[model samples]
Target: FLPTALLCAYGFFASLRPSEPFLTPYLLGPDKNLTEREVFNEIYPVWTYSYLVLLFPVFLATDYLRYKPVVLLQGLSLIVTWFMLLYAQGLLAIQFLEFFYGIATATEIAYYSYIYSVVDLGMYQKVTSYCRSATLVGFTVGSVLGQILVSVAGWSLFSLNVISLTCVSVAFAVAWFLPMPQKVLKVLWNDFLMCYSSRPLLCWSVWWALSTCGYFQVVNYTQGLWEKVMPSRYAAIYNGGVEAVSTLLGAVAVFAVGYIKISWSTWGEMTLSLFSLLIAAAVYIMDTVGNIWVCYASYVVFRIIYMLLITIATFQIAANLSMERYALVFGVNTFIALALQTLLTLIVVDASGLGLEITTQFLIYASYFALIAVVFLASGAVSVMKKCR
Candidate 1:
């Protein structure tokens, strides 16, 4: 219980990053003095590449270092990320900021992995939920806090970041208290093969990877869209409030799925298609509406649908595999999602490729979700046909 509580504390404090929702505005504002081009095309892309590149190695390192070191490293990275965001200037400096941010996010596997090593197997389900809830609640709290501070207190975004710096340092201090555990490592490839053998697993994993890729892209660049729709200088953007509401709604949707037991084996893929179509519609509206309220509502809708589907997908995948195998498949699916995201970033967002505008990026992302829906619908139709036969 002590270990679980500490890890949850670390997750909670580490996630209390009040400046996150307003990151783009801070960069483009007088504080950082970065151009939109530098932010959208140059600085942003580096985080994706660094996260994609670091994920696997960090996954392995979490096992080798027995979790505590990697967890502490994540804390350190978070401190560095916020420190740089507050004090650093210039394009390259910010690029390094994103790079360390990549490291911070990549090492999150340690937090998830650490619990298994410390607690008994019986505590797995309980601790997993506790840790996840801690992070989610922390994020929501941070968002709400940021919004209140900015709106009421008239706090600068720079001051929000300063609070973030303090919070993560507290997380680092907490991490120092986490007890180190013994070493344990295993092969990943064969576990992936063994776990992905079933058709339902394959279908869910496919949707997981594809939809997650689209989700990541939409989340990463939505701020740019908001800034375009209503410039931060003139419009009082409620990014933090929007984030808090959307995430709270998303969590509610995720929680609701547990009680609504549908025969997912029979109707799962079709349900996925329908909801994905909803997501497509949401993104389409979000991109073209040009109304900030509409954009915010659509984003909330998109997040709710994604969170609902992902919860179902998680249950479906975990139902068929052992804990170890589930972890392997989780890693593989996330890696595949990251790979797809990297390709998408390379072609769409990076200056090395087409480097389309923010509106165009959302258009393509809407198309991407529509494509996913179509493929799943076709597969679901065929599977139903086989059932009738």
Candidate 2:
């Protein structure tokens, strides 16, 4: 548990130190000072696309070799990523660097799947929440740290990357010493064919994938919104502050999920789907209000719900699936989700896409959740009716 917690902590801090809230301006680069918004648009989708394309293969490869190697690579990739963030000045170099970021992002699947493989079912609830809490708290604390560095201490972005490099370096050492479970979570494709083998499992896989698509699409691009709303210097701090609160809220809620002792099944798919609508509506309201304050609240609400619901999904997944296939099943779902995210970024948010104004982009994301809720509500309702009848 301690090592597992360390890995999650690593993920959290790594998330914190990225160019992030400042990424928009950072991409403006040392040489090119051009203010055209399209450059920013192109940059993120590259990360998104690159991140998605690499995920499934890496996930499968991790399963093939064992989780620890990928976990180690995850940290190493981040180390290289920060080095590039510090020194890589060319747009092409920066774009290529996102490939490593993709590798790092892809490896996170192991954190959850690894936990599923090693822990007892009875322990899943506790361990899952704690690991998740570590991630959230790490992100929350890291964001607070980021805010302090950028705002309170007036540190340069390069300094923040240095700190991040240190954290992941320790994370790599921790992960290296962590013991691997033998014959654990091995796989095949006709690989993911396993995930499609069950109905409820299929529903969960779909729900997981679709909900994640909406979450990533909005969350990844949100820095753009923050940049528009505030001055360049303050955007990182403001973004960090918002993330601090949001991830903290999520951190507390994840701990609560473990104790409530509820099964996602008992929680009822029907109720869960409807509440998903609340997330959608919250985003729409935020877009309509068009205030950064409203955006902040709505973003938190949306993210908090996402965190809770994914936790709930983990609950059901733990209860329902045999541990032997945890990696394969979850990996497939993640790939599907990231793939959807990639597609959306290309269509709606990227330079190649409609590339609507930020507000319109927000509204489009709002509509995406509504559409997501439709599938979940309709399918999830049938899932509920079966239990009741």
Candidate 3:
């Protein structure tokens, strides 16, 4: 658990190194001299799609490959990604680095099963919450560092590279210390499919996919919008600070939920999901009115609710599922998430291109929330039915 915590810390910091936050201004500003839409639409998603394509094979290979080798590969990918970020000349270089970034991230998803193995059922929520908290801390530190490097240091690519390289080095060092287990790779590819055949697991995966699709759509894209509405430096500071605080708070909530004697974890999940939908709706409405502060505050509220839901959902999986099933469930969850995200991205891009009002964006997101509500309600109903049975 200690080693896994350290690796997650590295991942958190490494994520903030990406070009997305600064890329828009960097390209459209004097330095890069490239078109914003061209880079966003044409360049970015190419690498992202490529990365998404590899999810299945990596998921299947989890049974055959050792966790240490995969962690090492993730470390290597981080190194290459940082190097490319430092030295890459054109859009193509950026795209290439992003592809590797995807690989590293996909590996992390598969690696969670390893985490499941080391932890007992009772410790699942507590451990998972701690891991999530560590990640948030890393993200906060990385984002702050990235902003400082860009703004105070005059956006020197070299400085960004230096920071990224340092993170990669730390990641490699940590990966070296992770424990490796010797398990026979007896679970064939077909068995992987069997992992999600259970009704409860499928329902949880589908609900997660729907809600997360809505969640990321706003969370991922809003930073750019915030940067446009507020001062660039202030935007980064606000985002990083909020994320740090929210994550800490989230960790506290996770700990509380884990230890508390709640009647049913699924009830807590249902309530949190409903709250998350409401918060998403409110943020969408506020964004349309050009209320930047309100929008940011809405995100904080949404983050808290989202984290709570996540913790409870994780508890359900850990309590109800076996370690061998973790990868398959997570993999299927990722596939559904990516598919929905792709559609959402296309809609967001096309709507923005047509100069649709923020209200339209909010409505699109609201629709997503409505869909999530349906899934959650159904899931809760099923859980109740099974209990009675």
Candidate 4:
């Protein structure tokens, strides 16, 4: 557990140092001399499309190989991309670098499988929460350090590379010391196919994919909108700080939910879904009103509810599934999520050309929550009827 925790911590740090968040600004900054928002606007979607393209092949390979090696390779890829961005000034070069970073992002799905293998079922909620907390900490620290380096030393992309390389060095050392499980390549392949063969599992996977799409869309993009509305340099800091606080609160919510042994029942699950919908509605209101503080407050409330629902859902899924088949189940789950996200990315990219207001973003997110509410409510009704039987 110590080794697993340490490795996850390293992963947390290494995973956060990517150029995506600040990439647009960096491209338009003095170093690049482009000073064109249009260039960044065009390139960002291309990078996302490239990432979607790589998701399938990478997810397929996870079922065949040892997880540790893949994780180490992910670390190496991060190092390479960071270095390329740091030293290369050309627009084409940076775009390619972002493409490579996308490859590394695919490894995270496999990482979750690896972590699941090492931890006991009873410990799943606690351990997963801890891992998530580490990730949040890493993101917070990385963003802070990046800003400091940029402001104090005027460090360019190369500095991000240097920091990433250091993280990779530590990751490699940790990976070397970790134990390797015997490969079950054939079983993994068979189970991967079997996940879709089970109707209940397929429904659950779709539920996860759809719910997560709405959740991630809002969480990922809202900060930028907040900055636009607030018009403050401190926007970034406030956003990050809000996330850190929300994550900590979410961790606590996970603990409480775990303690309560919340299982999926018709009423219970429906209640969770409704609460999530309420949060989504709040986010839309905040977005439209251009209230930065309200936005932050909504985020905190939403994150807590999100964490509870996620914890309960994950626990239910794991409890209902066999341990040996977790990797395969998760693989199918990843596919559904990736597929939805890819489609959404395409829609969002094209929507701008139609002269649509970005408020469409909030609408799309709210629609997702509505879908989740409908599905879960129906599922819950069925469960209640079954209980009466």
Candidate 5:
């Protein structure tokens, strides 16, 4: 309870970030200072590329430094990142901040894994759900608060950042008092090799990776989409509403996992089928529906199903792997996703690639998932035939 309380408190505080809903608009259109291409192509890539470059080393150290300190560092990096966002001048300064932002994100490997050391094996499930719920709650609170402040309280974006800084500082300070994990797991070379060389983890991670590629790419530019289709006055409220509702929907799915017993191994084929098809549908609606309300509806649907699939995927994979191998399995899995998302983003949305318009890029993502659905169904059919023979 103590660890969960502290961690969740930290989670809530951590998510007080003001810019999640309006970052693109703030960056590209707020001042009319930087071009969309500058933001979408040049600046955005820096974060992904930097994250890809730093993921492995940071993952390694996220344990070597122990979970508490790593989490503390995440707080510190966020502090630095937000402060720069508040006052940093020029594209170069803006770009430099992303490097630490990458570091901050990469170090988040600690938060999920930290619970293991602090609690008994039997309590793992309960602790996980609580922590996950807390993070969600935090994001919801932050989103709603941002909307209230912008529309109701009349706070500037910079003022919101100031509030976020206070929250992060509180979280960082709280992290200091939380006890360290009993044993910090290390990623040995042999351990790393064995985990990735296997098939189930690899395949699921491919699903995880591809989904993540589209997820981040889509969500990052949602601000752009919303701005184009909706009235300017209600942006913050609408954005907050989307996040809050979607998160609650996603939460319901997470809770549903325990009640509904999913036979992942035998029915994994069906799992992939639903996953791909829904993603394809969601992205299609998001792209084609010029109506703001409908677009928001589709985005929520996308998030709900996404949360469901990823949670199930996490369960299936965790069930398959030994508990001790958590680091090796997740480390490799997330690293692959980060790498793939980086490459895909460069080709699909960033300036260096084809750099399609927001609508066109979304249509491409729809097709991408549709392709994944076809592949999964065909492969599952082949596997079933082999077993039957």
Candidate 6:
């Protein structure tokens, strides 16, 4: 009970980053004095590559070292990220900042994986909800607070980051209080085949990797999109508000999933197809319409749909596996997703690649989701026929 509370506290504090919604703007504006080209092509792609390079090794580290040390590493990396955000200058420095930020995120596997070791299997659902909700509430509040401060009090982006730095400091302090796990388990490869052999596991895992790649790409670039559509110079950007509202709705959707009963096995792929289609439509409208309000609404819709499905996907995998297998599966799933994201980044966003405009990039993302819809629709139809036979 106490450990859960401490973990939730850490989650809340770690997530209370007021500066995130405005990060791209800060980089693009006089504060950082970076050009759009530098921010998007050079600086932004560093985080993706850094995260991909680090994720697999970090996953192994999380398993080998147990959870607490990596959790501390996350805390330390977050501090480094924010400190660099506050003080760093030039494209190279900013790119290095992103590398540390990637470390911060890569170590996040410890946060989720730690809870599984601490709590009983029976407590999985409840504890997951609590820990996830803590972060959600923290994120929602941070965005809302940032929005109010920026819109009303007219706080500078730099000052908002100071607040974030303080909050993460508190999170780091809280991390030391978490009780250490008494045991650690070795993860093996054949365990991978054993877990993936289950058809439902493989299906959901595929969705997890593919959709998550698209989701990560969309999220990483949405601020860039808002900057283009609304240009923070002409109008006060409501990015924080949009983020706050979208996160809240996503949380509500996740919460409601627990109470709603349905045969997920039968309906799951069709559900994935239908929602992917909607997500694609939303992304398409967001790109084509060229209206900030439309973009915001579509992003909100896109987020809520992904949240609902990902929540379903999480538990569907969790329901069947042991804790060790659970850890391994999720680790590999995220690694594959990051691998795909890296490939997409190299081909689409990196300077060496096509390096398309932001608008064109979003159009490709829309089509990517649309392709996911088609793949699932075909697979869902095939499964339906098999069941009938």
- The candidate maximizing TM-score is 1
Q: What TM-score goes with each of the models?
A: 0.97, 0.84, 0.77, 0.77, 0.90, 0.96
The C-alpha stretches of model 3 lying farther than 4 A from their native spots are: 1-29, 114-132, 144-161, 176-180, 183-202, 231-237, 259-261, 265-273, 346-362, 374-389
lDDT top scorer: 6
Whole-model Cα lDDT of every candidate shown, in order: 0.87, 0.70, 0.62, 0.63, 0.75, 0.88
Every model: Cα RMSD to truth: 1.6, 3.7, 4.7, 4.5, 2.8, 1.8
Backbone Cα, N, C clashes tallied per candidate? 0, 1, 0, 3, 0, 0
Model 1 C-alpha lDDT per residue in residues 7-94, reported as the tens digit of each score: 8998899988888898888999998898888799989889888989999999889877877789888989999998989898898899
lDDT of 2 by residue, 297-382 (tens): 88899878888778777667645677666666677677778788877777777766777667678888888888878877777777
**Candidate 3 TM-score, true structure as reference:** 0.77
Q: Compared with the true structure, what per-residue lDDT tens digits does model 6 show for residues 1-389?
A: 77788899999999999889888888888887898877898888889898999998888888789776999999999998999999988888999999999999988777888887778879876897799899999999899989999998999888999999999999999998889888523345666676777767577788878999999989878889889888776579988998999999999898888787787776888988899999999999998998899889999999999998898888788786776667677778889899999999999899878888887999999999999899999999989899897
Q: Which parts of model 4 are misplaced by more than 4 Å?
A: 16-42, 46-48, 87-91, 115-133, 143-165, 172-203, 231-237, 351-359, 378-389
Per-residue CA lDDT of model 5 for 1-389, tens digit only, reads 56678777887777666567656656654543667667766677778888888888877776677666778888899888887877776688878787878887787667777777778888887887787788888878878887787777777777777777778788788877878786613556655555557756455666766676667667767767776676454454457767878888999987786677666557686676677799789889888878888889988988988888777777767776788776657777778777887878878777768787776777878898898788778876766786687
Residue pairs in candidate 4 whose N, alpha carbon or C atoms collide under 3 angstroms: 86-157, 86-158, 266-380
Q: What lDDT is reached at residue 281 by model 1?
A: 95
Angstrom error of the Cα, residue 297, model 6: value is 0.7
